[PDB]
Design a protein around this ligand. Structure first.
Ligand SMILES: C[C@H]1O[C@H](O[C@H]2[C@H](O)[C@@H](O)[C@@H](O)O[C@@H]2CO)[C@H](O)[C@@H](O)[C@H]1N[C@H]1C=C(CO)[C@@H](O)[C@H](O)[C@H]1O
Ligand SMILES: C[C@H]1O[C@H](O[C@H]2[C@H](O)[C@@H](O)[C@@H](O)O[C@@H]2CO)[C@H](O)[C@@H](O)[C@H]1N[C@H]1C=C(CO)[C@@H](O)[C@H](O)[C@H]1O
Lengths: 605, 605
């Protein structure tokens, strides 16, 4: 019966003289005579009175306003609305109306003052698995050589760029991409709209993926060494691009001097009880060192050790800070396996240690961006503010895998409609403040998944829909290298093909779409800072609007046959008019005419 | 269509040779050909296969079984069930079926090994506001005297036991109850079924409630001093009773030597910049010391200070440990204002400090029980395991206030039916492991609320329903002193009447009900350890079953007119028969015949 609107952004909120003004919109025939702003100060629940505004913001809509005092309390301002009649109450939340009180951690929330990395919302990221992206022209003879991969039991193998990928020696096959290759491709990346790089590991390590860290203080010479990473840092700085390295601190590689399984230097932890780093690893009674999910090449680090803590993040000279200060001056860290890191061979005290890693990073570099790898549900980590963001597999990737590709994290069959997809995406982000939502690291696939283009199988025509959605859902988008020219393949090792630089092997129409979406995101504040209201979500169609001050961006996605959808009048959609910017959809008199398998974007004028 | 059953208790779980066996029950015509046990190890999501059991546990029910490996991982074992068909999936959770994956922190969960205070589940608590419970026979002439309450601006006032309570000098009126009075009433309390006491503050402080702590190391002489608390500790130990003190560590009183607002000893923080405890408090620019919600008598403690940390919980001699070791040997702490405690004048770093307080307590006393005062949503605190339990206002008290008394935390009108009430209670506890659920500190009212009997107003006939429910919902029940003989009154100050020892002023039928419910809880393992499945929840009727091994306890509550309710066949209810233990309800051939305004309890035979 009753209708309500609120988003944690202007025009609904406004900061004014140490006060956060909060406005709620209501419409209906049985309007509550009172409305309480339920807010919070230092975790104490507050009942703040709201007053009816004289001016109707839109026809048939009543506005209520309250104020959060900003001089006291913690920066994250949580709130919801308690509608009050003579005999009853009803809550309005990020997940519509609730008959019983919402969870404290599923309210609306705004971070004021926001101390997070505010530049993230303005970025378009691009993830590069360096061995497979680009070989520098002044390439490597000594770094196209071979050596013995102890953990693998044999020599690494070299392959030419057009040699097909095989399941054989997946961690030991090198196509020879390097960091100067990335530098040389910055014009391509700038042309794509990319403003920021996330690199898979680049420190000294024997494998091709290099999560088996051997030296945390040196860049692998295979990728061009320290010199080539200094050049990449310079070249991205010159082009105004951000640069994030992969930080692998849950475990080291078993060839690291601290562990030294293959006794390259008398042995650290594995074959020495008096080793200096003996207590940096955990050894069972049964003789198996604790490792990452049973991979002996990845011995887990024991953060009970106060010397290890100092080495990774506690000290001024710690690894986390080393790469964030000059000459390196990286922009932050992607935290590999952020969720298992801890003490005693497991995740004991994990949240404290992640909080310490992030704190150490911001100490060296206040605007550093620290986000964690979360295949699972990151909400406990983000709700405790131990990191800025997560790889948003649960809140973005897997909803799209189910709705568009009928599959999921385990490649189990999925059958979810638009209702369920959007309930899923909105439930997840209800756990996050607006500022957190805007910096969630969103991607369609990664070096640890099958390529989304392949997951679509016979429904590959849906791929452009996911691209539009990637650039218009709250979060910072990350392109996985090659996705934009149509690279496909199954999961690891097959998701890491060498990038096809031959334009004959490139999907140019897909490339152009990525370019156009990056321009729209760069152009429109609501696509970077806006709130997000799902307007319509039924069967094959999702419609949502991004909202920022007076601006609106309407997005309509239709995964199935051509159809028409009626959009009820909404005060969020009450604009002078709409300009179609991308896609073939059409809007007229509240009727969306949506072609089959299409995504469309309108800007309000 | 499909039906599913699972509770985190036998017969559904069983520990066997470092393995947790997990069984799921399914029934229906379109049963999934595969079921995945979604589990977790060191926060990594696991896909464990389940196999169909040959033996049907009950007619028409299929059983699936999986195993969690217990040798690795953290003690809290989280899991849910992923039902798999050829084209689709469906999740089974504590909140029934979900079409998208449940939250990590809303799964089933079992703590194995359980390091919490396992004795709590066996208790019946009784909360005593000491000034208002009982005056010792060898009473106090010097402690029936008067003195100057600086923070109040006048002398404390003394009142005779039958003098009515008034809003005047609510914090400064003393009826003279003391600790030896409690000792002398232990036979009454043992007769009631009480096995454990929670005392409001008893340390030296000028007010009657004594949350304005002046000396953390001494018992107030008004209550009989250190000697009388030693006697109470002895007498409860003799009677096999547990004893919990109120720990007020978010703030001190402003008369404490550390603060010393009234310069009783040259002044600590308030009137001295070189004070030893200057940095134990926070002073604004504007001249107002930071305090508890604007009460100058309660200056907030600044846990940034490393000396304060050592004094409260860090040191061997710290306040938290002092009262847990001999000669005091208390059984734990109720943490006042647990949610605001922190650094800098607010809740900054709250979770770390509460975790430290609990850790210090368990260091002194491994089975200590630490639970926090949570008027609001305690789930973030409990999900991070920073305390054992909470005063369960959000999960128990306020659901009953709405469903039975049409009101809520703010005394705002509520209109919720059985559906909403039970959705509320089950949603809250879905955030908690079974072991956490069993030790949630449940009560109908407190020294900080109106008496539930008064809140019921014209619906006071519903009071016995709340009593039955208090003893049969998962959690440890706490009787608020006088509730059991029918004491009423509005909120603070009027909720703290002197206990009516004259039997003419006592509701004896209500007393007897409390006695009988305590006997049933003591008698039946499912009322102390059992899982809990809501069987029926519509309009005025709530039916739930507690489940433990082969035993069942069925509870049916009807807040309205007499009615009949059909209970569908349930494999949880498939027993040899039912013995009615309390109430006038009747069960026959799946038909519950429930009198008006009634609660009934059956034991399976
Ligand atoms: C062993 C494992 O090592 C890396 O996996 C890492 C992830 O890529 C990364 O995102 C990080 O957060 O944590 C992981 C551990 O450090 C390699 O990239 C992976 O290729 C993986 N290699 C294994 C891959 C398997 C199946 O993909 C496995 O069966 C192979 O033996 C290994 O090569
Ligand atoms: C000022 C305040 O002090 C105590 O309140 C405490 C709670 O009882 C207790 O549960 C704890 O966790 O935290 C509170 C602060 O320490 C007294 O018990 C209360 O009576 C309260 N006294 C005030 C009561 C008010 C309304 O009830 C207030 O308007 C009076 O001036 C005060 O007496």
């Amino acid at each position: 019966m009753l209708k309500a609107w609120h988003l944690p952004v202007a025009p609904f909120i406004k900061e004014q003289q140490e006060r956060l003004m909060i406005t709620l919109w209501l419409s209906g025939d049985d309007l509550p005579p009172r409305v309480t702003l339920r807010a919070e100060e230092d975790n104490e629940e507050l009942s703040l009175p709201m007053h009816r505004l004289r001016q109707a913001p839109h026809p048939g809509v009543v506005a209520w306003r309250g104020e959060i005092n900003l001089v006291n309390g913690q920066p994250r301002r949580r709130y919801s609305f308690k509608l009050l009649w003579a005999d009853r109450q009803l809550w309005f939340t990020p997940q519509e109306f609730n008959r019983f009180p919402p969870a404290r951690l599923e309210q609306f929330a705004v971070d004021l003052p926001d101390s997070g990395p505010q530049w993230v919302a303005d970025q378009v990221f691009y993830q590069i698995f360096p061995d497979r992206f680009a070989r520098s022209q002044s390439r490597e003879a000594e770094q196209d050589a071979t050596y013995y991969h102890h953990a693998a039991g044999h020599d690494i193998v070299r392959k030419a760029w057009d040699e097909p990928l095989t399941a054989e020696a997946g961690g030991s096959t090198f196509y020879g991409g390097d960091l100067d290759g990335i530098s040389e491709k910055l014009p391509y990346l700038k042309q794509l709209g990319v403003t920021a790089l996330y690199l898979n590991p680049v420190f000294v390590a024997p494998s091709v993926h290099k999560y088996d860290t051997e030296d945390y203080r040196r860049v692998d010479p295979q990728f061009g060494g320290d010199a080539a990473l200094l050049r990449l840092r310079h070249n991205t700085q010159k082009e105004g691009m951000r640069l994030i390295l992969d930080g692998v601190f849950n475990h080291s590689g078993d060839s690291h001097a601290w562990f030294d399984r293959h006794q390259r230097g008398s042995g650290g932890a594995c074959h020495n009880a008096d080793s200096p780093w003996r207590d940096w690893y955990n050894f069972s009674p049964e003789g198996v060192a604790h490792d990452w999910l049973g991979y002996a090449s990845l011995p887990k680090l024991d953060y009970r050790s106060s010397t290890l803590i100092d080495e990774i993040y506690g000290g001024e000279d710690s690894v986390v800070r080393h790469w964030l200060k000059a000459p390196w001056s990286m922009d932050g860290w992607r935290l590999a396996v952020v969720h298992m890191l801890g003490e005693g061979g497991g995740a004991r005290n994990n949240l404290r240690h992640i909080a310490g890693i992030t704190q150490a990073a911001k100490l060296e570099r206040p605007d550093a961006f620290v986000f964690g790898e979360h295949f699972g549900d990151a909400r406990q980590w983000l709700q405790a503010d131990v990191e800025d963001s997560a790889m948003n597999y649960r809140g973005f990737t897997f909803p799209l895998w189910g709705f568009l590709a009928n599959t999921d994290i385990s490649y189990d069959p999925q059958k979810i409609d638009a209702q369920t997809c959007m309930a899923w995406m909105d439930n997840y982000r209800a756990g996050l403040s607006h500022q957190q939502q805007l910096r969630m690291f969103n991607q369609l696939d990664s070096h640890d998944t099958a390529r989304f283009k392949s997951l679509l199988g016979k429904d590959v025509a849906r791929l452009p829909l996911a691209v539009v959605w990637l650039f218009s859902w709250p979060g910072v988008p990350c392109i996985y290298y090659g996705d934009e020219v149509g690279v496909d393949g199954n999961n690891d090792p097959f998701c890491r093909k060498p990038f096809p630089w031959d334009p004959a092997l490139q999907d140019g129409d897909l490339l152009d779409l990525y370019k156009r979406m990056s321009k729209l995101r760069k152009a429109h504040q609501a696509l970077r800072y806006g709130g997000c209201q799902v307007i319509y979500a039924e069967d094959n169609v999702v419609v949502f609007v991004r909202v920022y001050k007076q601006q609106r961006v309407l997005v309509a996605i239709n995964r199935g046959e051509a159809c028409e959808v009626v959009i009820e009048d909404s005060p969020l959609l009450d604009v002078n008019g709409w300009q179609l910017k991308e896609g073939a959809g059409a809007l007229h008199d509240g009727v969306l005419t949506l072609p089959a398998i299409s995504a469309s974007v309108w800007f309000s004028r």
